[PDB]
Amino acid sequence: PVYCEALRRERAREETLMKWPHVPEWKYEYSTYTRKHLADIVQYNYTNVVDYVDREVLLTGKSVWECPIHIDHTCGGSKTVPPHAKKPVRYMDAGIANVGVTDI
Amino acid sequence: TARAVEIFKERLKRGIYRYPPGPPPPPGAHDKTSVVKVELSCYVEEERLRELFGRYDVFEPHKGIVRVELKLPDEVLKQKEEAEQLWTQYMAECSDVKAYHQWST
Amino acid sequence: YEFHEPLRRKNAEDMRQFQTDVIDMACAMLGERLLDTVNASDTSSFPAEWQEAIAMHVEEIEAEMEEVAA
Amino acid sequence: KNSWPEWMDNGADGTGYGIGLHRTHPLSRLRGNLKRSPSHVPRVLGMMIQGVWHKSGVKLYFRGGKPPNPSVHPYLTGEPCPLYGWKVTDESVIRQFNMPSIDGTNFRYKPYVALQKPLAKRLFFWR
Amino acid sequence: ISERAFMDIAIGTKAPRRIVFKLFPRKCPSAVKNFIELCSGNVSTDTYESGNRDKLISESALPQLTYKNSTFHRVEKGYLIQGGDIVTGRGTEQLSIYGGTFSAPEEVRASVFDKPGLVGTASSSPNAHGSQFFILTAKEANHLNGTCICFGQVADGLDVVQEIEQVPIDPSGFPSLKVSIVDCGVLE
Amino acid sequence: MVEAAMFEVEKDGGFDNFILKRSGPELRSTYGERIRRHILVRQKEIQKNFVLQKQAQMLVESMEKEILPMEDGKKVEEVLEKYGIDKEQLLRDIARAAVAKKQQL
Amino acid sequence: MFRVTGLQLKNPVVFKQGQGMFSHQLKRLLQKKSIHRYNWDPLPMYDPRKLVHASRHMDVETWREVPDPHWDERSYLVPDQMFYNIPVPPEYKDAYWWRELQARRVQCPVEWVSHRMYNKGDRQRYDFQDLAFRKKFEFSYEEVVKNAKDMRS
Amino acid sequence: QERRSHRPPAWDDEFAKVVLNMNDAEIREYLMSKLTDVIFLETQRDGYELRRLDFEGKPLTSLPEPRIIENFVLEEETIRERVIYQVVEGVFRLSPTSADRRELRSVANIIDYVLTHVRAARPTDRERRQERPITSAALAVMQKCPIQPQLGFVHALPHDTRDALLQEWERMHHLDWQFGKAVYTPRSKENVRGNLTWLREDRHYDQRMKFMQEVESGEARAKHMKLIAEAAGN
Amino acid sequence: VAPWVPPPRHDIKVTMPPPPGGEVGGRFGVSQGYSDRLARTPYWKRMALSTYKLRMMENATRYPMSEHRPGEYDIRYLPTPYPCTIRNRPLLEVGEPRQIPSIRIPVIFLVNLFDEAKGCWFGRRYETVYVERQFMREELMPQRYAIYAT
Amino acid sequence: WRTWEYQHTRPDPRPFPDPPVNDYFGRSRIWNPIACKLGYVRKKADEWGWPNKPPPPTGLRYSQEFFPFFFERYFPDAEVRLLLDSVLNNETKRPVFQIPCSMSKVELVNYLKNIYGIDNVVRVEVRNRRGRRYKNEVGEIKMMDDYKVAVVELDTPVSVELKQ
Amino acid sequence: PMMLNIQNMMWWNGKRNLYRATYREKTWYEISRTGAFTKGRRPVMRQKYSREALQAALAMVPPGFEVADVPRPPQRILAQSEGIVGRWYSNYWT
Ligand SMILES: NC(=O)c1ccc[n+]([C@@H]2O[C@H](COP(=O)([O-])OP(=O)(O)OC[C@H]3O[C@@H](n4cnc5c(N)ncnc54)[C@H](O)[C@@H]3O)[C@@H](O)[C@H]2O)c1
């Protein structure tokens, strides 16, 4: 009984961490709340680096490929969603993009 | 940590730890019970097997047996699965042939 | 183990007390049977020391009954 | 009764030394009065907003001006003794930085990896 | 190196009987040295009045590294007999010469138990060994391979072991008769 | 309790029988749970006392075959010491049985 | 409820109810929500892990319990968080009836998942047993298509 | 915790046996009479007559009153030390502790003190067992007995947090059996009549004995073989 | 948090689901039982582990009664998943006074009891006597002179 | 009351409460003691990759070998910045440094003794300091990380000359 | 309290009655639909077997049985049929 109780307490402390706290995998509230407008994004993550690098490329001519500043399009909202979040699969979407027409 | 948790779970399954320092008692001196595996050609009720293998000298409802558990080998289980798969295929093919030749006849 | 050791120590003590009570009730039944067989059957009596002890303890128990009744 | 030591409650020293919020290490055996419970939040928030008023007449925790940050306190290392200024009961809490030994490659390495002059005040350096 | 030890075991008021252990230092130099030092028990540290006063405590107040006045706490009839606890006679804590407990993984791996009457280190963990030693009594215990470490064997005194094993067990879990160790020494 | 509870506890034939027939959510009270645990442990003690009395009966029936003649007092003492039953308390119990029989008659 | 309680407590303790930045920040920080974990009501009257040694015979030689396989089988398992499952004789399982309900119920306030029972789809796809909102089985679209195509309809 | 019965080395084994042969409730009256006589002697020597005197001719009564003895307390040293040296060392051969002398003022405290000491001097259950062990023949017959007792049922008691004063008030107001409460007292012998549990156990034991008779006669194996033959035939 | 979720009650059938928890003894409010193991078990595995006779014996229905709660109808057959009320109901309906008379209960005596006041026997040994409820509850039962007649 | 006129939607509470995000970036910024579920979730996820990987046992979790403590002990991370004005072109006996708030006097003296070899340290004067706050061109309030000021005292005055 | 005509609804004011079921299997409107509950003008068995299948279903009927034995279930019992299963003759509607 002593060894069994130790084993069961270990299993209990394992399952508690595995199941708690229970957060939902994904809900539409995530995408509803982490939506910020262009003005809000610009107000949130802006530095003089963009204007300075614009002047620098205008004066030099070097080709820049990646943006010089990391843009967080959520304005600090992406850190609110749990890390294991992923969009669920939606079967039979009511859209026309999956047909891939090129003539209309 | 993966290697370590594997080793530790193996040790725990072996059951070698004991708070009073010292080797644990042996398993053979403890397991005061026996198991009997009987092969049957068809399914039989557990209460039937119990009343047929019960000890006639034990005045207890368990009749000298603890538990009777029925199982099927993995070979025959896979055989039954393949058999039902083939049976579904055969039903589909027979219905297809019937509905295809009902108009040809 | 610290939680489970007294739980089995108490059971062991209870088993020992059960055996002691078994011995005591067996002695009581022995007394009752020897008594209701000696006074029933004939040519079967206790030794002299046993008879003297039984008589003195009978007198003591009668005195105790008188004390508890008074 | 509380879980944190009664000297943490009211400092054993006469001048109230050792009173306030003391964060403890997770592996440390000592406990602190920093608890995030819904029932322990009022007192721990009052300790930051107002502070504790002592009988001697001096305000020990949050004397005024700037509120402290209890989450960034270095972990507790011991308990105050009246004989000395401080009594250390846990030595593993105090981190001990240690340098690795030198080696033929160690003294040959450099911070950056080698990929295959007059200072001029500039308003912006790209890289 | 002296590879022979002896102990005097007494069962309550009975006469002390001699038991002899023969150890193998080649396959496990740590446990054999620990057992030899614990059976020797160099505790002749004699202090003076002023010395004891400035130290405030006799050095004998702490547990002494010797099997003297020890007891055999675990005596199970048919399997083995365990004893040698130092800090207390109950058998709930170990203590080695190096410190609280040592470890010898390369030795405990190759340690095997194939004979009746072997001697091993009674431990809770395969790498947490102390002063508690157990003498096996059963035929063979192969389930202990790779868990405990064997260092020696009872050379003379199998009759003593079998006589100690036949002690009635008190409901408290300990032997009813206090099986203790009168003296213990090393023979060169 | 309620009047209907009194009626049903008189119907089923006893408070203990009622508390044992009711189980789990059917017995929502906590006084009932406490008194049921007490009744359970008391019943276990009753069974233990029954086993005790049966053991005593078997012991006296086994050892009476050696003191039935009561021909040699030393032989009776040997039979008593074979099992280890005290003699002074035995004589005391004999005297108590004598006084009880005298009071009965 | 808890938010209002904490707000009143902080207002009575450390809030001066002035335009100070302290109170201005408290009025917004107190709206944060604390951790919620369903704590089952402990039973000090009856300790379930104590009845392990109950209703068991013991060997008179070694003075320890007998590992009865019949008892080990018929033992009823009571659940608890620190003591995940505990065996207990079936005679004493009646006193632990409420722990069974508290364990079967989802460890979450019903009004957080009440959006399930308020629609027909979830009312049909979910289970409501002892207030346990655990989703039932549901075939995949590929699975149902394969089943129907094998059934030829 | 293991308890060891200890006897002070003040008295010898003979006096120890003489004292231990007395029952506590019976030796209490002996102690009471001894202390009453010595207190009466002390009061007569001092000059204060504790005994009642009729105003008609001033005669002395028979003996001091037990209620007066219980109400009498020791406050003067010349009285308390005298009675202590007279009864504690004289008739019981005990010695008091310096700190214990602070509580030894009351005569009821003296009674409780000497009672606790004689209870401690009385042997314990472990010592009684070590004196009288169980024999192999008794073990053999108890094993041959078919039924065996079940244990551990004491663990099924409802364990609650109760104070001594609360329990005493409960006992005084008869609340021990109110609101689904009870008191567990171990009883070796049980009253056997109208006991449904005992009747069920008697019936079970009789059925077990009949089953034993059947299996000894061989009819049980006959029925089992008949069932086997029926299952083989159907 | 729940580390171990108790399995559904009376889950002994290999193919059919167990009866509702309210019918087994748990909480009411549901009209159908469910088992995660029986749901996740494939149909071919069910048919392999079972046989036709066992399937028929498990599909044997007791409409419209119940097997585990005898004497009353099944909660799934009832309109509301809660048990019936007209069978077991309070002893006093709404708008009804408590005009219940004094009932006399049968009791089995264990000893020849002789009433000294009236000068007669209350009941012979092992005799079934119709006695007063309060009398049996407060006087006969405690002295163990008689036990309830069942 | 006409309840049938409305549909089944919960109206917003009046007055509406503010978001729990603290928007003050001044001298009196307060640390929120209330613990959120997302904090525990993120802690567990960074600890042992929840919920993909199985959780390590309680022994390894509470031991000194758990990955965060092991990495903090074998690869310490402490940002120690020297003020150039305090020691540049002036023989100063009290050089000042900037450290994280989780360090102490003993931590800093051990740091300087073991890593940089500055053993002769007389006394370290500790004084916390709120992080530097500023506004950018668009007016967004961005505050630098907090830092603890330390004023270490040496036996000999030191100076690093700037070759002009 | 007595909750005399109090409009306590979660969507109305966020307060619910203290004595009520947190879950309802069938809304009160569904219970009132006695036409779908009882057997009124409505079929109860949706399985239609062939002639050979009916003879196989009638083969498992035990001898000594009679239709007069099975009574009509009361109105407070749902009219459902599980098809041809074990002891199907006991079901009145089947
Ligand atoms: N008020 C009414 O009862 C009502 C109203 C309209 C029509 N009907 C018709 O009356 C007949 C008997 O009604 P009832 O109430 O006695 O029984 P029912 O309709 O309730 O049950 C008849 C059983 O036979 C089956 N069945 C029905 N029509 C069938 C067919 N053509 N071939 C094979 N199986 C068939 C049903 O599915 C059911 O199993 C049915 O044809 C029904 O459609 C009845």
Is the CB–ligand 1 distance for residue K51 below 6 Å? no
> Nearest C-alpha to atom 22 of ligand 1 is from which residue?
K43
- CA dihedral defined by E146, E148, E154, E155, rounded to 10 degrees? 40
C38, F101 contact by CB (below 8 A)? no
Residue B34 is which amino acid? S
Tokens representing residue I89 in the block = 């109901």
Question: Could you give phi then psi for residue A57, rounded to 5 degrees?
Answer: -70, -35
Nearest CA in chain B to J65: B1
Is the CB–ligand 1 distance for residue K86 below 6 Å? no
**What is the distance, to the nearest Å, from the Cα of residue H154 to the centroid of all Cα atoms in its chain?**
19
Tell me the H-state helices in E91-157.
Answer: 105-110
Residue whose token pair is 């008739």: H91
SS3 I69: coil
J89, J162 contact by CB (below 8 A)? yes
What distance in angstroms lies between residue K42's CA and the mean position of ligand 1's atoms? 8
- The span from the CA of F7 to the CA of F1, in Å, is 10
Residue H151 is which amino acid? L
- Choose the closest CB to J30 out of G29, G31, G36: G29
Q: CB of C2 within 8 Å of any CB in chain A?
A: no
Q: Residue H54's CB: how many other CB atoms inside 10 A?
A: 9
- Choose among J6, J5, J39, J1: nearest CA to J20: J39
- Choose the closest CB to A12 out of G36, G83, G107: G83
SS3 G12: helix
- The span from the CA of G95 to the CA of G104, in Å, is 16
I-contacting residues in F 5-44 (Cβ below 8 Å)? 7, 10, 12-14, 17, 24-25
- Choose the closest CB to J1 out of K7, K10, K11: K7
D42, G13 contact by CB (below 8 A)? yes
Q: Which residues share a beta bridge with E74?
A: E82
Residue J6 is which amino acid? Y
Of K38, K39, K42, K45, the residue with max ligand 1 atoms within 8 A of its CB, to mutate for a pocket test, comes to K45
User: To which H or E segment does residue A43 belong?
Assistant: helix A38-44
Q: Residue H196's CB: how many other CB atoms inside 10 A?
A: 16
What's the sign of the alpha-carbon dihedral G63, G68, G74, G77? positive
- The span from the CA of H133 to the CA of F85, in Å, is 10
Residue D44 is which amino acid? V
User: To which H or E segment does residue J69 belong?
Assistant: helix J67-74
C1, B20 contact by CB (below 8 A)? yes
Q: State the helix-helix crossing angle for G2-13 and D41-49, rounded to 10 degrees.
A: 40
Residue whose token pair is 């010292």: B22
Q: Mutate one of D95, D99, D101, D102 to test the J interface: name it (highest J CB count within 10 A).
A: D95
User: To which H or E segment does residue C49 belong?
Assistant: helix C48-69
Residue whose token pair is 């000297």: D7
Q: Do B80 and I51 touch (CB under 8 A)?
A: no
Question: Could you give phi then psi for residue D35, rounded to 5 degrees?
Answer: -130, 135
Residue whose token pair is 């990955």: J67
User: Contacts for C60-68 with beta carbons within 8 Å, 24 or more apart?
Assistant: C60/F95, C61/F95, C61/F96, C61/F99, C62/F99, C65/F99, C65/F103
User: To which H or E segment does residue G79 belong?
Assistant: strand G76-79
- The span from the CA of B96 to the CA of F89, in Å, is 97
- The span from the CA of G132 to the CA of G126, in Å, is 9
- The span from the CA of J76 to the CA of D97, in Å, is 7
- The span from the CA of J78 to the CA of J147, in Å, is 11
Question: Could you give phi then psi for residue J158, rounded to 5 degrees?
Answer: -115, 160
What distance in angstroms lies between residue K72's CA and the mean position of ligand 1's atoms? 18
I-contacting residues in G 19-58 (Cβ below 8 Å)? 37-38
- The span from the CA of C65 to the CA of C70, in Å, is 9
Q: Which residues share a beta bridge with J141?
A: J135
Chains J and A lie in contact, requiring 3 or more CB pairs less than 8 Å apart: yes
Give the residue numbers in I contacting G (CB under 8 Å), as ranges.
1-6, 8, 20-21, 26-27, 29-30, 33-34, 36, 39-40
Q: What is residue J99's DSSP assignment?
A: E
- The span from the CA of B14 to the CA of A37, in Å, is 61
SS3 J71: helix
Tokens representing residue D3 in the block = 């879980």
Is the CB–ligand 1 distance for residue K48 below 6 Å? yes
Query: What atom in ligand 1 is closest to the CA of residue K81?
Result: 39
I125, I112 contact by CB (below 8 A)? yes
G34, J32 contact by CB (below 8 A)? no
Q: What is residue G53's DSSP assignment?
A: G
Between vectors from CA D65 to CA D60 and to CA D69, what angle results, nearest 5°? 70
Q: Is K39 marked as binding a ligand?
A: yes
Q: What is residue G124's DSSP assignment?
A: H
Q: CB of G67 within 8 Å of any CB in chain B?
A: yes
**What is the distance, to the nearest Å, from the Cα of residue B22 to the centroid of all Cα atoms in its chain?**
36
K91, K71 contact by CB (below 8 A)? no
Q: Do G28 and J20 touch (CB under 8 A)?
A: yes
- The span from the CA of A43 to the CA of G151, in Å, is 60
Residue whose token pair is 């592996």: D27
- The span from the CA of E75 to the CA of E89, in Å, is 13
Q: Which chains touch H (3 or more CB pairs under 8 A)?
A: B, C, F, G, I
User: To which H or E segment does residue H15 belong?
Assistant: helix H13-20
Tokens representing residue G78 in the block = 């009571």
G10, G32 contact by CB (below 8 A)? no
Residue whose token pair is 């035995």: F90
D86, D76 contact by CB (below 8 A)? no
Tokens representing residue D106 in the block = 């160690």
Terminus-to-terminus CA distance in chain G, angstroms? 55
What distance in angstroms lies between residue K93's CA and the mean position of ligand 1's atoms? 12
Of K38, K39, K42, K44, the residue with max ligand 1 atoms within 8 A of its CB, to mutate for a pocket test, comes to K44
- CA dihedral defined by G46, G50, G56, G57, rounded to 10 degrees? -120
Residue G110 is which amino acid? V
Is the CB–ligand 1 distance for residue K45 below 6 Å? yes
Is the CB–ligand 1 distance for residue K84 below 6 Å? no
Q: How far is B67 from chain E (nearest CA, A)?
A: 28
Q: Mutate one of C19, C30, C67, C68 to test the H interface: name it (highest H CB count within 10 A).
A: C19
- Choose among I36, I12, A10, I26: nearest CA to G104: I26
- The span from the CA of A74 to the CA of J109, in Å, is 42
- The span from the CA of K75 to the CA of F78, in Å, is 83
Nearest CA in chain B to J61: B1
SS3 D89: coil
Length of chain D: 127
- The span from the CA of F33 to the CA of H156, in Å, is 12
- The span from the CA of H27 to the CA of H30, in Å, is 5
E74, E81 contact by CB (below 8 A)? yes
Which technique? cryo-EM
**What is the distance, to the nearest Å, from the Cα of residue E48 to the centroid of all Cα atoms in its chain?**
32
Q: What is residue H175's DSSP assignment?
A: G
- CA dihedral defined by J53, J56, J61, J64, rounded to 10 degrees? -100
- Choose the closest CB to A46 out of J50, J54, J136: J136
Query: Could you tell me which residues come within 8 angstroms of residue G114 by beta carbon, excluding any fewer than 6 positions away?
Result: none
I40, K69 contact by CB (below 8 A)? no
User: To which H or E segment does residue K28 belong?
Assistant: helix K28-32
- Choose among K53, K48, K63, K57: nearest CA to K91: K57
Of K38, K39, K41, the residue with max ligand 1 atoms within 8 A of its CB, to mutate for a pocket test, comes to K41
Residue B26 is which amino acid? P
What distance in angstroms lies between residue I57's CA and the mean position of ligand 1's atoms? 29
User: To which H or E segment does residue B48 belong?
Assistant: helix B46-53
What's the sign of the alpha-carbon dihedral J14, J20, J26, J27? positive
Q: Do G81 and A12 touch (CB under 8 A)?
A: yes
In C, which residues are within 8 Å of G86 by CB distance? none
Residue whose token pair is 């024999």: H135
Q: CB of C38 within 8 Å of any CB in chain F?
A: yes
Q: State the helix-helix crossing angle for H107-121 and H24-46, rounded to 10 degrees.
A: 140
D41, G32 contact by CB (below 8 A)? no
- The span from the CA of E144 to the CA of E111, in Å, is 9
Peptide-bond breaks in chain K following residues (C–N over 2.5 A) = none
- CA dihedral defined by D68, D74, D79, D81, rounded to 10 degrees? -80
A14, J48 contact by CB (below 8 A)? no
E125, E98 contact by CB (below 8 A)? no
- The span from the CA of H101 to the CA of H82, in Å, is 13
- The span from the CA of A16 to the CA of I2, in Å, is 7
Q: Is K15 marked as binding a ligand?
A: no
Tell me the H-state helices in G1-153.
Answer: 2-13, 21-29, 69-74, 97-104, 110-113, 120-125, 141-150
A-contacting residues in B 10-69 (Cβ below 8 Å)? 12, 15, 17-19
Residue D45 is which amino acid? L
Terminus-to-terminus CA distance in chain J, angstroms? 87
- The span from the CA of K60 to the CA of K88, in Å, is 9
- The span from the CA of E169 to the CA of I10, in Å, is 45
> Nearest C-alpha to atom 37 of ligand 1 is from which residue?
K46
- Choose among E117, A6, E139, A1: nearest CA to B28: E139
Of K41, K48, K81, the residue with max ligand 1 atoms within 8 A of its CB, to mutate for a pocket test, comes to K48
- The span from the CA of E137 to the CA of E120, in Å, is 12
- Choose among F26, B14, H222: nearest CA to E125: B14
- Choose among J100, J72, E125, J48: nearest CA to D26: J72
Q: Is the peptide bond before A21 cis (omega within 30 degrees of 0)?
A: yes
Residue whose token pair is 């940590």: B1
> Nearest C-alpha to atom 6 of ligand 1 is from which residue?
K41
In I, which residues are within 8 Å of K85 by CB distance? 56, 59-61
G49, G84 contact by CB (below 8 A)? no
SS3 I94: coil
> Nearest C-alpha to atom 10 of ligand 1 is from which residue?
K41
Query: Could you tell me which residues come within 8 angstroms of residue B42 by beta carbon, excluding any fewer than 6 positions away?
Result: I51
F99, H154 contact by CB (below 8 A)? no
Instruction: Give whole-number Cα distances, H75 to B53, E119, H66, H70, H79, in Å.
Output: 83, 68, 19, 14, 8
Q: Residue B33's CB: how many other CB atoms inside 10 A?
A: 9
SS3 I131: strand
Query: Could you tell me which residues come within 8 angstroms of residue D12 by beta carbon, excluding any fewer than 6 positions away?
Result: D18, D80, D82
In H, which residues are within 8 Å of G44 by CB distance? 159-161
Residue whose token pair is 């004493």: G92
Tokens representing residue F68 in the block = 């039935």
Q: What is residue E134's DSSP assignment?
A: E
Interface A:B, Cβ pairs < 8 A: 5
F8, F18 contact by CB (below 8 A)? yes
Q: Do I25 and F4 touch (CB under 8 A)?
A: no
- Choose among J143, J18, J31, G28: nearest CA to D49: J31
**What is the distance, to the nearest Å, from the Cα of residue B92 to the centroid of all Cα atoms in its chain?**
32
- Choose among J25, J29, J30, J19: nearest CA to J136: J25
Q: Do C23 and H138 touch (CB under 8 A)?
A: yes
Peptide-bond breaks in chain A following residues (C–N over 2.5 A) = none
What's the sign of the alpha-carbon dihedral E121, E122, E126, E129? negative
- The span from the CA of H182 to the CA of F45, in Å, is 15
Q: Which chains touch J (3 or more CB pairs under 8 A)?
A: A, B, D, G, K
F20, F32 contact by CB (below 8 A)? no
Length of chain B: 105
**What is the distance, to the nearest Å, from the Cα of residue H103 to the centroid of all Cα atoms in its chain?**
25
**What is the distance, to the nearest Å, from the Cα of residue A7 to the centroid of all Cα atoms in its chain?**
39
Question: Could you give phi then psi for residue G44, rounded to 5 degrees?
Answer: -75, -25
Q: CB of E91 within 8 Å of any CB in chain B?
A: yes
Burial of J132 (0-12, 13-18, 19+ CB in 10 A): exposed
Terminus-to-terminus CA distance in chain H, angstroms? 65
Instruction: Give whole-number Cα distances, C1 to C5, E86, E93, E95, I28, in Å.
Output: 6, 20, 13, 20, 41
Q: Is the peptide bond before J51 cis (omega within 30 degrees of 0)?
A: yes
- Choose among F83, G54, D25: nearest CA to J64: D25
Q: Is the peptide bond before I19 cis (omega within 30 degrees of 0)?
A: no
**Interior/surface letters B34-51, b for 16+ CB within 10 angstroms, e for the rest:** eeeeeeeeeeeeeeebee
The CB-side HSE value for H230 (13 A sphere, CA atoms) comes to 9
